[PDB]
Design a protein around this ligand. Sequence first.
Ligand SMILES: O=c1[nH]c2sccc2c2ccccc12
Lengths: 198, 196
Amino acid sequence: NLPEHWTDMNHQLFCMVQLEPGQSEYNTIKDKFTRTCSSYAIEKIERIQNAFLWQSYQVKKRQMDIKNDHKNNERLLFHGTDADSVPYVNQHGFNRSCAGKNAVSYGKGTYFAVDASYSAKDTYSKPDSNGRKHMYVVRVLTGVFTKGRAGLVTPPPKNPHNPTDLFDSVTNNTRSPKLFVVFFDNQAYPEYLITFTA
Amino acid sequence: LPEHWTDMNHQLFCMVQLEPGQSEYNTIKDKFTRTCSSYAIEKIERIQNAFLWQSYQVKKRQMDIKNDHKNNERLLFHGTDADSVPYVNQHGFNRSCAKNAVSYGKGTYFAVDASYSAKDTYSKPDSNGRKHMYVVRVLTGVFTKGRAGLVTPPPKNPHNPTDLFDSVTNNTRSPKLFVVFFDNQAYPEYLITFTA
Ligand SMILES: O=c1[nH]c2sccc2c2ccccc12
């Protein structure tokens, strides 16, 4: 299942691949980022090759493509975090149990932003001892979503009389989504780690 | 999708009531009655949930590789209230649903013995006195003693903080309970409806 443009990992389960500026792969991410963070400068963009996380994500993706039929279930979103979390996220991905309370809470889950500018805030992408900030670029199974609310520990039901048939995620605003919250393991794949500085 | 499953007519979710006196029913019944012979079984249902099964088996193949042996699975019991059954059947075990103690961490708790899950704190009687307990395939893998406030199992060596145990327990020499902290580390295989 592992994508054919990945570096061969020598039967190994994980590695970070440093991208070259000039590559379309680095340049599209750099544009995605700079679209809203042109004040910051990119140190490097690493491709995250996590075999196990990839398989789990892809199983969850196929399931949601079957459940929802003809939907764009997948968005490419940003996640700022501190240096001390990068090793865990790289290995194990996004754990809602670890999530910070967001300044505007639309539920108890893992938050993803549309705009790099939002993830670029010191409150998420916290500067390390050397001034380095860290932002993931994340494939997120947003699926069918609704405006969330602070109490949510799972997405709400589409229909109150069928409690178990859930939305896939929640947003801050369904007509102009700037945030998405995700409540399940293996619903986000951390694809790139952007290291940047002022 | 396993051999003993029955036809679902191209559907991905079915609860299938077992036939008393047949082999599968007799196997699940005995594991319960080992410690719960004073109770009364009203029925045993096989949970056929293709998606949960797939996600579970994926985690199982990852844990067999990572642990370089095939010893990662145990059959354990989960007692729950009637209002949680529809959720568990369709979505499995969610650590975020959280009622009872979390002494060995903030995951989902499973018992070695049915008698443990058979307590009313866990398998809460409804109006009619009906109690509910899952027989659950759990990926216990390599385990350690748990403690309060864990959000994941501990690291196997603090030098490598991301190489984690698969589960925690109350007692490593003779465990009576296991806590798992990740979605798809438990597949609910049977639902036993019974009374005191
Ligand atoms: O069977 C159990 N169900 C539930 S629900 C919250 C905790 C527990 C639990 C804890 C230890 C052993 C079994 C169970």
